Amino acid sequence: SVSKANVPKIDVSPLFGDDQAAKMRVAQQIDAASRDTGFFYAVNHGINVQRLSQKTKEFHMSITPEEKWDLAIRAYNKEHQDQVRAGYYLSIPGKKAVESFCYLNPNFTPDHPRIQAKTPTHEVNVWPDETKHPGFQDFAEQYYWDVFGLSSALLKGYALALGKEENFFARHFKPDDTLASVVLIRYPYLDPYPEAAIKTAADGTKLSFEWHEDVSLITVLYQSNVQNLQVETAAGYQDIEADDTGYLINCGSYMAHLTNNYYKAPIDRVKWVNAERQSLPFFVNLGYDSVIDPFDPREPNGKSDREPLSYGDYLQNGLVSLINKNGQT
Numbered sequence: 001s002v003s004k005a006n007v008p009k010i011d012v013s014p015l016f017g018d019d020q021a022a023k024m025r026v027a028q029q030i031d032a033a034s035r036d037t038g039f040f041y042a043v044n045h046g047i048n049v050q051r052l053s054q055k056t057k058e059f060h061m062s063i064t065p066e067e068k069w070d071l072a073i074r075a076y077n078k079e080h081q082d083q084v085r086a087g088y089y090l091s092i093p094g095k096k097a098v099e100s101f102c103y104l105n106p107n108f109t110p111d112h113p114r115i116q117a118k119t120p121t122h123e124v125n126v127w128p129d130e131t132k133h134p135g136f137q138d139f140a141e142q143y144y145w146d147v148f149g150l151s152s153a154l155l156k157g158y159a160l161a162l163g164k165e166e167n168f169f170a171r172h173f174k175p176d177d178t179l180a181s182v183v184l185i186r187y188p189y190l191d192p193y194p195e196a197a198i199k200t201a202a203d204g205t206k207l208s209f210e211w212h213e214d215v216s217l218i219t220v221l222y223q224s225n226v227q228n229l230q231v232e233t234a235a236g237y238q239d240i241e242a243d244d245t246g247y248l249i250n251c252g253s254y255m256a257h258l259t260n261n262y263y264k265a266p267i268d269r270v271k272w273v274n275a276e277r278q279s280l281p282f283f284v285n286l287g288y289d290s291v292i293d294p295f296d297p298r299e300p301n302g303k304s305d306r307e308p309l310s311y312g313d314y315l316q317n318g319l320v321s322l323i324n325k326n327g328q329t
């Protein structure tokens with residue numbers, strides 16, 4: 001038997017406004033969720049998620065094999081050695097069901113000094129032909145900034161929750177340097193569904209993606225209305241119920257580092273479900289040189305002996321290790 005996770009719905013709208021006590025009441029709810037199962041649904045977030053889902057489906061269902069090779073990351077196309085993050089992540093019929101498209105900060109262009117300096121984790125996005133995918137790039141770039149704005153407000157809530165001033169995290173989250181990414185993931189319906197694309201957990205559960213901690217400060221996730229996620233608790237995995245109107249929020253392992261594990265990065269996994277669905281995460285990453293001084297809210301002096309960690313090193317190592325442990329997606 002599998003129980004169900006408590007995932008509170010938090011009205012985050014005060015985080016966009018100037019009612020400081022209302023913001024504190026949101027922060028309390030974020031604190032409580034972060035200390036419990038680690039997840040909450042952000043509601044009243046102001047993003048048109050119906051349009052996000054519609055435009056994403058139109059892209060996934062119209063892109064051709066030729067276009068996927070043309071956009072493929074280096075793991076699938078040796079000609080594209082600069083594409084470690086951004087681009088298309090191909091399915092392998094018979095073996096791998098999932099496929100996805102990842103893009104980064106649209107401000108990463110050839111003019112950007114991090115591109116000029118060839119700093120790891122910075123890449124120029126690749127896009128399909130506009131005439132073949134009318135409106136897609138424009139939608140996707142505007143979405144990046146829409147979800148950036150939501151995430152900046154959520155980071156104010158997390159800062160207040162931890163007893164800090166509201167800009168404690170958000171001051172490091174900036175359009176000119178953020179390493180944040182959007183991933184547009186398609187999980188297909190397949191008949192028959194090949195067993196090679198299905199993993200078996202230690203507890204027997206059939207999975208599409210194994211347990212992991214998120215590589216992020218926080219993760220801001222939209223999913224279509226098909227239940228699939230489970231969060232690890234001490235008493236076992238618990239089902240996270242779906243909600244295609246809201247965003248599922250949780251802390252990543254950078255938050256766990258800087259709070260001395262006071263806000264843990266929850267472990268989740270993806271159950272296998274034979275259903276056509278979407279998983280559209282926004283990974284809230286800081287700048288390459290961002291360093292937040294660690295602290296311990298449990299200690300009266302807030303002191304932590306954990307070393308400050310540069311976000312760029314954290315991200316480079318984390319993305320590599322996640323591929324090594326859980327496979328190339």
Ligand SMILES: CC(C)[C@@H](NC(=O)[C@H](CS)NC(=O)CCC[C@H](N)C(=O)O)C(=O)O
Nearest residue numbers: 085102181183185209214270279281283329
């Ligand atoms: C909802 C999640 C479990 C989703 N999985 C994911 O997004 C998994 C686990 S957090 N994330 C990743 O693989 C990291 C992608 C990082 C991205 N290419 C980048 O360069 O920034 C899924 O639906 O599988």
Ligand SMILES: [Fe+3]
Nearest residue numbers: 212213214268
């Ligand atoms: Fe996760």
